Amino acid sequence: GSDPQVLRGSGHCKWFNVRMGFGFISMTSREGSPLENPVDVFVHQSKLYMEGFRSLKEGEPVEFTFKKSSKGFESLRVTGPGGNPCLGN
DNA sequence: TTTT
């Protein structure tokens, strides 16, 4: 019934490195409110909603769930706008 | 699997 640290956010891919299997999202809104200061959120390839090889393209818009982690923040599931598949490279 |  509860998972209180899990929040919803939106933004765009800051960078993504397919050799390393991760990148960052620049989060520009959370919990339905735009942010005065964008926040980087780590994104691992395993979290990307899409078929085939998983990546994010620099600048593509994303919606996601995330949670604070030991090293920063962590994306938990990442989609395009409206829950459609991410585009990637 | 935490910086670009």
UniProtKB/TrEMBL annotation:
It comes from the Eukaryota. Signal peptide: none annotated. It comes from Xenopus tropicalis. The chain holds residues 27 to 113 of 253 of the full protein. Belongs to the lin-28 family. This is Lin-28 homolog B. Residues 8-80 form the CSD domain. It is found in: Nucleus, Nucleolus. The lineage of its organism: Eukaryota, Metazoa, Chordata, Craniata, Vertebrata.
